[PDB]
Symmetry: C6
Subunit: 65 residues, 6 copies
RNA sequence: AAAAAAAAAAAAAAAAAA
């Protein structure tokens, strides 16, 4: 089955800073606030909506259980 | 399940937004409407933006 | 929706179709279906919608 | 109603030259020889297979 | 049914092939195998290429 | 399929792998795990690489 | 461009046979 939900849920739960590298190289830094089938909400100065199809990677700022 | 409430909030409040496309271009306007595949943005005219080409939607201020 | 928007075709407004690579294509929306839109300028060319980022009217429609 | 098969089949039937602009700007010129739901076959000396998902615009060298 | 006949023809005749990715990168090797979403190309090693990132599959010579 | 067993070869033999993204960036680490949409690449941290942004994945050595 | 471990982001190069 799926493993994307637990990976993002581990970061959202533990409040660990995360880097979302987009398909064009731009690195979004913030906190996973929520996510659904198609988007993730990244939080910093404001809460923005990132489309999953335009993400290449999601890197945790530190190892996560 | 949560994309609509996000965009919808931007429509209720009439808050300026900044849509970043997959190629880094930053479009700015007002979310007037949207459907499963596109978001209608406004400024001078009403332009139709395909969601498959949007990389990010940033509200100009917290809502 | 995208159909009532594209249906630009009626008012014969000139339109720009920005591609995902930044290229601007100016013509007129001649026709469309589920996947493509045909734009007219010198010939009727076929523009795939998956390569489209923005459809801007030259003026309020 | 499909607006795609007739457009390509007309370029095939009239053996009219074409230019396939890819999503990265590369312009491939050749002849539409065949196509299915996912690919077009462009022809010069060697027939190559082009994926539709990488195509941005298919344009005819002349009105068809 | 147009992809399968094409790739299999290069896989059967062992024809050197160029796989142009969507970002312009040109891979050169041989079509060892393929499935609905990937093509396994070969040279010093058998690398897996996703179809969604390929733009063209060109034979080194007519086939 | 042609990618479920392919990734598993790198997941079982612990061979360092290289993942090239659609934008040319080369990732490097070890296939920790994978599913229909993602691959976890390991090094300092275990990052989640989306398949749709993957063009190629080459084993660093013949497998 | 056999490939920039990655430009908090070019309101946008009618288009680099790559």
């Amino acid at each position: 089955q799926s493993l994307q939900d637990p990976f993002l849920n581990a970061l959202r739960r533990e409040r660990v800073p995360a880097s979302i590298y987009l398909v064009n190289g731009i690195k979004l830094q913030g906190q996973i606030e929520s996510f659904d089938q198609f988007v993730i909400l990244l939080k910093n100065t404001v809460s923005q909506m990132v489309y999953k199809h335009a993400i290449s990677t999601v890197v945790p700022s530190r190892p996560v259980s």
